[PDB]
Design a binder for this molecule. Structure first.
Ligand SMILES: Nc1ncnc2c1ncn2[C@@H]1O[C@H](COP(=O)(O)OP(=O)(O)OP(O)(O)=S)[C@@H](O)[C@H]1O
Ligand SMILES: Nc1ncnc2c1ncn2[C@@H]1O[C@H](COP(=O)(O)OP(=O)(O)OP(O)(O)=S)[C@@H](O)[C@H]1O
Ligand SMILES: Nc1ncnc2c1ncn2[C@@H]1O[C@H](COP(=O)(O)OP(=O)(O)OP(O)(O)=S)[C@@H](O)[C@H]1O
Ligand SMILES: [Mg+2]
Ligand SMILES: [Mg+2]
Ligand SMILES: [Mg+2]
Lengths: 580, 11, 189
C-alpha cells in the first residue's frame, strides 16, 4: 500500500534525477526485462557508480517517452523494507503484507518492482521459528516469470550473500557496471548542472567542471568518478552562497574548485599564499640555524618541497624519497625532525628496530588475519591517511626485515599502499626520509698506516649490499653526511648552550659563558669519528653538574647570574654563582 | 553465538 | 575552530549528501563542534542560512529501550526521521556513529539503522552530523562503502599550543565557578 512508491509519479514532480548518458547500460536492462526467461535483471556495480540512478532514471525515461513502446506502458515500483517491517509485530503481518503486494504485481503483468539492496531481504522478515523470509516467498513466483523485478548489489555483497542463494541467482541475470569515462562524466555534470545551479543560485563554468573531474580523480582516491565529481560541484556552490558578501562571486570560476578538492583531499592547494611562500623561501637558513653543515642534504629536502608546491612534481610518486647515511652523531635525524617543525606538519616516526621480524612488518601494511581485535588496519596506512601532508621518518631502516623494502618499492614507484581492509593511502604529499648506519663501522675504523684513510667509499659498498639497485634507483637521492668540522663544533656548542639556558630559565637562572670557555669545551669534546654526541657529555660534566649541586643545595636556588670563564694557568673553568 | 531474537505475540 | 566549522556548514548547505562526519582522535573536540554549533547559533554569530536550525542528539540506548517486539525499533526510528523530514530545518547529531551500523537486527536480519537512514541521506531531506574516532571509522564505518559515501569526512586535527591556551581561557569561567577558584595565566601556559 504505502511501502511501494510509484517512481513514475515522482518523475512528474521532478524529484527523480534525470539520467544522462548510460545509453548502453539501459539497453541491457530493457532487453533482460523483455526476454522470456531470466526476466529479472541485476545491476551489479560499485558504490556511487550510478546503478540506482539507472533504475530511477528508467522510470523518468518512460514518462518522457524515449523508450520502446513495450516499456512505455510499464510502471516501475520501489519497495521500502523499513516501512514494511515497521508494524509487523503480530504473527503473519509480514507474510500478509508482502504476499498482498505480490498479488498486485501479477494481476497487472506490466509493473516492475525495483528493490535496491536485494541482499537485505535474504534474511529479513523472519525473526525466528517461522523462517519465512521474503527471498523464499518471492522465489516461487519468479520461477513462472509472471513478475519481473530489478535488483542492485555490490560485488562483495553479491558474492558473500547473494551468491549463496543459488535459487535467486538463477532467476536474476547479472549485469556488470563500471564507472564512466571522464568524457562521459563531464556530459553528466552539464546535464545535472541546472539542478545544482538553481539550488545554490550560482552558474558553473564549463571549464570548472572539467577541472573538477580531472582534479578529483588525481587526488580523491576513496570514491568512484561520477559521485566524486558531483561532490566537488555541490560543495563549490555551497561555499559561494556562504560568502559574507551578497553572492558577489555568483559564477563558479576556475581555481575555486581547486580549493574544494584540496580541502577534501587535505593536501596543499595551488596559488600558494604569501605566508607559505615566505616559509619556503625562509627555509634555506632556518634549517641551517639548527643543523650546521650538511648543506647538500638540506637543499635536497627543500628542492623536493619547492618543486611539489610549485606544481612540477611526479605524477604518481611522492614529493621525495631520501636515504640519509653517514657517521654517528651527524644531523641525519635532527634535520628531518626540525623539517617537520619548520613546515608546521606532523612528524611520522617509525623506529625500524621494532620491525626486525617478518610478523611485525605485516602490522605496517595491515593486520594479521588471526587477530580478532576491532583495531584492524596498518600502522603506516592509518598514519598516512590521518596526516597525508607529513614527514615519514624510517630510522635505522637497515635493521628492518627485507620484506619492508617490498612495501617501500611500490610506494616510491606507485605512491599508494592499499591495506588489508582495502583503504587507499596516498603518499603523494608525504615526504619520505629514511636513515641508516650501514657502513658506519668503516667510518670509525682506523687504517693500519701512518695516515688514516677515508673509508667513506668502502662504506658505500656496504650500503649497496643491503639496499638492492632497484631500491636505490627509485630513491630520488642518496645523501652522505660529511663529518663535523672544527668550525661547525663551535656552532653546535652554542646550540647546546642555548638549550641549557632554556632549562635554566624555567628556574629563573641565567647563564653566561665566555667565548674562551666555549672554545675550550670544543677542543675537549671534538671527535670527528664520534660526531657531536660527545659534546653533549662535555656540557653535562662541565656545566650541568656544577650547577645541579648548586641548584638543589646551593646559592643557585633562584636568580642565577652565573658566569663561566677559563683559567689559562690551569686550563680549567672557574664558576661564579650569585644568590641574587 | 549471542544473537537477539524478536518475538511475535499472537493476534 | 573557524576553519572546521566553515566546512561543516558548507557540507550541510549542500543540495545532496549534506551529512558531515567529524573524524579525529579522542579529545580533539569532535563533540565540541557539534554541540558548539548549537551554542554558536543561539549566540547569533552564524549565517542566516543556519539560524533557526535545531540540533538534536540521538541516544541509541533510549531508542532500543523497549524494542522487544518485531518491528518496534523500525517504527521508532522511522518516526524520528519523519519529524526531521517534515521540519526541513533540523539536524540529527549522531555521536559514536559506528554503533548505528548494527543496532536492531533479527536472528539473520541484514536490516539495521544504517539501511533505513541510507535512502534519506542520499535524497538530502535530512541532515545528519556524525562523530567517530579514526579507528572506529576505518574498521567499522568504512567497511560499509554505501553509508560512508553519503557521509563527508571532516578531519579534526589536534590544536597547537597557542590554540589550546585560548580554549582554556574560554572555559576558565565554567571551571572556576564549579570549584570557586581562580586560575592564573602562568598556570594555563
Ligand atoms: N547517469 C546518471 N545520471 C544522473 N545522476 C547520476 C548518474 N550516475 C550517477 N549519478 C549520481 O550519482 C549518485 C550515486 O549513484 P547511485 O546509483 O544513486 O548510488 P547507489 O547505488 O545508491 O550507491 P551505494 O548505496 O553506495 S551501492 C546518484 O544518486 C546521482 O546523484
Ligand atoms: N649537524 C648537527 N648540528 C647540530 N646538532 C647536531 C648535529 N648533528 C647532531 N646534533 C646533535 O646530536 C643529536 C642528534 O643526533 P642525530 O642526528 O639524531 O644522530 P643520527 O644521525 O640519528 O645518528 P645515528 O644514531 O648513528 S643514525 C642532538 O642532540 C643534536 O642536537
Ligand atoms: N574547540 C574547543 N573549544 C572549547 N572547548 C573544547 C574544544 N575542544 C574540546 N574542548 C573541551 O575539551 C573537552 C574534551 O573533548 P571532547 O568533547 O570529549 O572531544 P571528542 O572528540 O568529542 O571526544 P571523543 O572522540 O568523543 S572520546 C570538551 O568536552 C570541551 O570541554
Ligand atoms: Mg542506492
Ligand atoms: Mg637517528
Ligand atoms: Mg565526543
Amino acid at each position: 500500500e504505502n511501502f511501494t512508491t510509484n517512481l513514475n509519479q515522482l518523475a512528474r514532480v521532478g524529484g527523480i534525477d534525470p539520467l544522462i548518458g548510460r545509453e548502453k547500460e539501459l539497453e541491457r536492462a530493457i532487453q533482460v526485462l523483455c526476454r522470456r526467461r531470466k526476466n529479472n535483471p541485476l545491476l551489479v556495480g560499485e558504490s556511487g557508480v550510478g546503478k540506482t540512478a539507472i533504475a530511477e532514471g528508467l522510470a523518468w525515461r518512460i514518462v518522457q517517452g524515449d523508450v520502446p513502446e513495450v516499456m512505455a506502458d510499464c510502471t516501475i515500483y520501489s519497495l521500502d523494507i523499513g516501512s514494511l517491517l515497521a508494524g509487523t509485530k503480530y504473527r503473519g503481518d509480514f507474510e500478509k503484507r508482502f504476499k498482498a503486494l505480490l498479488k498486485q504485481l501479477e494481476q497487472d503483468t506490466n509493473s516492475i518492482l525495483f528493490i535496491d539492496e536485494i541482499h537485505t531481504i535474504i534474511g529479513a522478515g523472519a525473526a525466528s521459528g517461522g523462517q519465512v523470509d521474503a527471498a523464499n516467498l518471492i522465489k516461487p513466483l519468479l520461477s513462472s516469470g509472471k513478475i519481473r523485478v530489478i535488483g542492485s548489489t555490490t560485488y562483495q555483497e553479491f558474492s558473500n550473500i547473494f551468491e549463496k542463494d543459488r535459487a535467486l541467482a538463477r532467476r536474476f541475470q547479472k549485469i556488470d557496471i563500471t564507472e564512466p569515462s571522464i568524457e562521459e562524466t563531464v556530459q553528466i555534470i552539464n546535464g545535472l548542472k541546472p539542478k545544482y545551479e538553481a539550488h545554490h543560485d550560482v552558474r558553473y563554468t564549463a571549464k570548472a567542471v572539467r577541472a573538477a573531474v580531472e582534479l578529483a580523480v588525481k587526488y580523491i582516491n576513496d570514491r568512484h568518478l561520477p559521485d566524486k565529481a558531483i561532490d566537488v560541484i555541490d560543495e563549490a556552490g555551497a561555499r559561494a552562497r556562504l560568502m559574507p558578501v551578497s553572492k558577489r562571486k555568483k559564477t563558479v570560476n576556475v581555481a575555486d574548485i581547486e580549493s574544494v578538492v584540496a580541502r577534501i583531499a587535505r593536501i596543499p592547494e595551488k596559488s600558494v599564499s604569501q605566508s607559505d611562500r615566505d616559509t619556503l623561501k625562509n627555509l634555506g637558513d632556518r634549517l641551517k640555524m639548527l643543523v650546521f653543515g650538511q648543506d647538500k642534504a638540506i637543499e635536497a629536502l627543500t628542492e623536493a618541497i619547492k618543486m611539489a608546491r610549485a606544481g612540477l612534481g611526479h605524477e604518481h610518486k611522492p614529493v621525495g624519497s631520501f636515504l640519509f647515511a653517514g657517521p654517528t652523531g651527524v644531523g641525519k635525524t635532527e634535520v628531518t625532525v626540525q623539517l617537520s617543525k619548520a613546515l608546521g606538519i606532523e612528524l611520522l616516526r617509525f623506529d625500524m628496530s621494532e620491525y626486525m621480524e617478518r610478523h611485525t612488518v605485516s602490522r605496517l601494511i595491515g593486520a594479521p588475519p588471526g587477530y580478532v581485535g576491532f583495531d584492524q588496519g596498518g600502522l603506516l596506512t592509518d598514519a598516512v591517511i590521518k596526516h597525508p601532508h607529513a614527514v615519514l621518518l624510517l630510522d635505522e631502516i637497515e635493521k628492518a626485515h627485507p620484506d619492508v623494502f617490498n612495501i617501500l618499492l611500490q610506494v616510491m614507484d606507485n605512491g599508494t599502499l592499499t591495506d588489508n581492509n582495502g583503504r587507499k593511502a596516498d603518499f603523494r604529499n608525504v615526504v619520505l626520509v629514511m636513515t641508516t648506519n650501514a657502513g658506519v663501522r668503516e667510518t670509525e675504523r682506523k687504517s693500519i698506516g701512518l695516515i688514516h684513510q677515508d673509508n667513506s667509499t668502502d662504506a658505500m659498498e656496504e650500503i649497496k649490499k643491503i639496499f638492492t639497485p632497484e631500491f636505490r634507483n627509485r630513491l630520488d637521492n642518496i645523501i652522505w653526511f660529511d663529518h663535523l668540522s672544527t668550525d661547525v663544533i663551535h656552532q653546535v656548542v652554542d646550540k647546546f648552550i642555548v638549550e641549557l639556558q632554556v632549562q635554566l630559565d624555567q628556574k629563573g637562572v641565567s647563564l653566561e659563558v665566555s667565548q674562551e670557555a666555549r672554545n675550550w669545551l670544543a677542543e675537549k669534546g671534538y671527535d670527528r669519528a664520534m660526531g657531536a654526541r660527545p659534546m653533549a657529555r662535555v656540557i653535562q660534566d662541565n656545566l650541568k653538574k656544577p650547577l645541579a649541586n648548586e641548584l638543589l643545595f646551593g646559592s643557585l636556588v633562584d636568580g642565577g647570574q652565573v658566569t663561566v670563564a677559563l683559567d689559562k694557568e690551569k686550563n680549567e673553568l672557574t664558576y661564579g654563582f650569585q644568590s641574587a | 553465538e549471542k544473537v537477539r531474537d524478536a518475538l511475535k505475540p499472537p493476534s
